[PDB]
Ligand SMILES: NC(=O)C1=CN([C@@H]2O[C@H](COP(=O)(O)OP(=O)(O)OC[C@H]3O[C@@H](n4cnc5c(N)ncnc54)[C@H](OP(=O)(O)O)[C@@H]3O)[C@@H](O)[C@H]2O)C=CC1
């Protein structure tokens with residue numbers, strides 16, 4: 001077989017679906033691994049390090065994809081309308097694997113159907129115990145939870161930890177984490193590392209044990225995700241939190257209802273009650289936002305409060321993000337590779353493949 | 361007795377020489393505390409909160425300073441020659457207290473002297489043990505050290521701590537600190553706590569113990585020309601991800617500790633934080649106020665790092681002044697009287713009553 | 723002149739106490755004795771003894787030195803107090819556990835200008851009933867001046883390394 005991985009020409013994207021470790025493995029399986037001349041300068045992976053593992057270096061995106069039986073990407077390919085017809089570069093008959101963002105981006109899937117490409121959407125992984133290996137949403141959102149705190153620290157004009165000083169005591173920062181999943185838990189862990197006093201809240205009840213284990217305090221207002229509660233709950237979610245939210249210095253917002261847009265936890269009216277120079281990091285900004293003041297791509301200064309809402313947070317940790325994403329891909333691929341008849345035999349029954357597959 | 365505190369008109373300066381807590385201590389000492397409107401906005405300190413502590417508010421710097429007997433400021437006042445004559449606003453015969461940078465900047469000293477203003481260079485606070493509560497160099501630089509790590513962590517492409525995911529493990533960031541004074545030593549702590557693997561180096565032999573006390577590792581050889589120890593620095597700097605430079609020999613320019621020939625033998629995606637950028641840089645590729653990139657390695661050289669933590673910096677800066685000031689407020693009579701036998705007053709006092717005093721330049 | 727004591731001696735003193743307060747300093751950090759120090763404070767908390775940490779603002783070799791290491795060892799902020807709101811509480815405390823500290827306890831700060839420690843605020847450890855120092859030797863502190871508490875008081879010189887002698891104490895307490 002012959003697998004190919006291109007550079008990401010989507011502006012911002014420094015991530016890649018490859019690493020030198022993953023190149024070794026695919027060769028071991030029986031894949032000629034082709035990569036592009038600089039795919040992963042942002043991920044901080046040199047071409048020669050990929051070649052040491054046993055990968056060819058292509059000149060361009062087209063020469064990489066042209067004879068590619070399998071194609072691994074991070075982002076969905078660009079449609080012709082979007083600028084450059086990347087879907088057309090991929091050989092008709094090839095197997096694509098990336099975060100297609102399928103349910104949103106139907107025009108992309110149309111093109112893949114049009115030229116016989118068997119495309120596999122990684123965001124649509126079933127939430128089953130063994131699938132954590134292959135889940136990109138978790139791997140990337142864990143790194144998004146860490147960096148929430150660093151972006152928070154970067155924008156915050158005070159220091160996080162308590163320091164007893166000759167010139168006096170700087171008090172510890174007060175962090176509040178909204179939503180305690182893969183990202184939310186890391187944010188607690190990371191804020192804790194920097195000496196903050198972390199508190200958190202969630203819809204899910206078993207969360208209280210998770211937060212307390214990291215060393216935070218809990219504030220207490222069906223398949224591995226929060227069911228939407230309604231404004232009955234949203235109203236009760238105001239005043240129970242307000243006590244802490246006022247004196248709170250930094251606010252990470254994680255919450256995501258998988259079907260719907262993101263639930264409004266911090267209103268514009270709540271923002272006003274906080275201290276001046278407080279920071280809010282909105283991670284759900286690309287999906288409506290838990291804070292409706294938050295605008296994608298940019299930091300919104302209003303009410304004496306910074307409101308950060310970067311798009312593509314995992315790319316801001318592109319060098320950690322990328323090898324883990326590549327490992328999610330390999331974990332999905334490995335149980336279907338048939339060496340001895342060195343081919344990719346994607347089982348049509350494995351629940352992994354059922355929820356992943358769309359076109360073929 | 362009036363004490364005024366203006367807004368810091370210099371560019372890239374969010375700090376202020378006051379806090380509500382210090383206002384209450386000054387009021388208690390028998391002053392009334394005038395402050396220029398919106399002088400603590402940058403430090404997240406509203407004038408509402410200052411008036412709450414018992415402080416008058418002024419409209420302009422003129423209205424603030426015009427009648428003030430004592431004047432607190434963060435960074436040195438500006439002369440006409442620079443653009444805006446802040447020294448002119450200060451009342452004749454008054455007391456000034458700030459970071460003058462007096463020894464480098466003679467014209468600001470002569471300007472204040474022309475106007476009979478008694479100035480105190482807070483950076484010339486003697487290194488005695490009692491004066492550690494008044495040492496502005498320590499308090500600000502400690503925060504600047506903490507910042508380096510946050511700035512390093514921002515520009516860096518991986519996370520600091522090791523993370524064992526279901527989807528595989530990512531190794532921790534490795535950090536190297538050049539210069540283990542107040543700044544770097546807090547950077548070691550801020551790095552180690554974030555989960556990074558931290559190393560450091562220093563000309564002083566007593567440093568190894570300090571570095572080791574935070575869980576850092578001191579670069580030193582196993583076993584002369586000792587300065588083939590740069591091979592040990594090379595050996596680590598090669599696999600270093602973030603390199604925070606601190607070394608800052610005083611008065612003289614910043615000693616070069618990372619040459620370009622070393623920057624090139626270094627991982628692309630690396631970061632260099634140069635806190636010494638304004639003194640010259642310990643890496644001479646570093647440019648004041650901007651993030652240069654060469655040989656793959658980002659070279660960060662922000663000016664006025666303490667102002668990046670302006671909100672924590674400001675109350676500490678103000679307390680340094682208050683700790684220096686409080687001892688000399690008699691108030692059996694409404695008077696500040698500065699004892700000369702006090703060594704803090706000896707060391708910091710540059711000009712007095714229309715004549716220059718300090719033996720550094722007379 | 724000098725009194726001395728073993729980890730068995732320090733166990734007899736502190737386990738039979740109502741209130742001890744801990745005074746960390748540069749030696750704790752040097753010896754990285756911070757996880758053992760929480761553990762000794764955990765044993766005393768389980769026994770029913772009152773425990774608090776007294777952080778002199780200038781203890782260690784940097785600001786926030788004792789804080790970061792006590793935080794590494796997962797001491798909660800609740801029990802940590804600064805000099806300015808603690809050293810009245812020493813007289814209502816049976817044992818003053820001083821670990822790696824020497825200059826910050828020296829009462830010559832509030833006595834004579836023949837010392838460079840003069841003028842500086844210091845933790846009033848002498849106010850406690852008995853004062854447990856832990857340093858390796860008779861050697862000076864950062865100042866290069868000797869504490870008068872050494873030749874004084876109910877002061878005990880628990881001579882050795884701070885991690886190991888705190889560890890040996892924890893074993894003696896069970
Ligand atoms: N925090 C800061 O920002 C700075 C503080 N300082 C100075 O530091 C001093 C602070 O005092 P403090 O840190 O409390 O005490 P010391 O400064 O006296 O710390 C040194 C003491 O620790 C002991 N020690 C060294 N290693 C060990 C070990 N392995 N186990 C047990 N003890 C050990 C030494 O005794 P022995 O050799 O016998 O083991 C010595 O007496 C002040 O004088 C201050 O001026 C100065 C600059 C900055």
Ligand SMILES: NC(=O)C1=CN([C@@H]2O[C@H](COP(=O)(O)OP(=O)(O)OC[C@H]3O[C@@H](n4cnc5c(N)ncnc54)[C@H](O)[C@@H]3O)[C@@H](O)[C@H]2O)C=CC1
Nearest residue numbers: 127128129132179180181182202203204224226255256263
């Ligand atoms: N295959 C598997 O076994 C997987 C299981 N999981 C589990 O699912 C949980 C959450 O997963 P994530 O992907 O992080 O969830 P998510 O990304 O869909 O949402 C983030 C978190 O926000 C919370 N949340 C949503 N709406 C909220 C609201 N309105 N108010 C307060 N909190 C709200 C949820 O509880 C969720 O934990 C984790 O604890 C994890 O154990 C996660 C990934 C994979």
Ligand SMILES: NC(=O)C1=CN([C@@H]2O[C@H](COP(=O)(O)OP(=O)(O)OC[C@H]3O[C@@H](n4cnc5c(N)ncnc54)[C@H](O)[C@@H]3O)[C@@H](O)[C@H]2O)C=CC1
Nearest residue numbers: 487492495498539540541542562563564606607608609615
């Ligand atoms: N009032 C007081 O008692 C104070 C005491 N201090 C003490 O002084 C020490 C130094 O603090 P600062 O003056 O802020 O440091 P600094 O800003 O003068 O220099 C930083 C560090 O870089 C080192 N260095 C300088 N040039 C170098 C070179 N070419 N190569 C390698 N290393 C080089 C120095 O040894 C120093 O350790 C601290 O450890 C602290 O304990 C610091 C502030 C106040």
